[PDB]
Symmetry: C2
Subunit: 75 residues, 2 copies
């Protein structure tokens, strides 16, 4: 509905199609990593690095936000 | 910097950024779930097609157990 570029899921679908053609046991994490890092980047940019505002926007507590940032080496 | 560059549509991450930029341009408190569902649905669809419906194969490719995959499919009425 709100995530378009048309909807995002179509870009994900096409990316997976190209990937499979180029062929694994970490596909979920592989995709999550490619989706979470940019999400964290954008939300942090939007709140100017304010973790509380970012967490609240995403609907997750600050602790989980910081865990994700750390996981991707963004701390 | 980034985990991988095998997902392209021109990295997939760029599409996510564009979708978000365009979203913000349009109060939010569920952005993570919004993005998670928009990405998990197509992933499960494509993985299941690749494994021709074999759930055990899909879970193994995805790196999760049978039950978790089961839970995800149900959530998106794909069960």
């Amino acid at each position: 509905d709100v995530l378009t570029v048309k909807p995002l899921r179509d870009s994900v679908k096409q990316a997976l199609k190209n990937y499979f053609a180029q062929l694994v046991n970490d596909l979920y994490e592989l995709v999550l990593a490619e989706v979470e890092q940019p999400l964290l980047d954008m939300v942090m940019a939007y709140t100017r690095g304010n973790q509380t505002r970012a967490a609240l926007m995403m609907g997750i507590n600050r602790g989980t936000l910081r865990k994700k940032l750390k996981k991707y080496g963004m701390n």
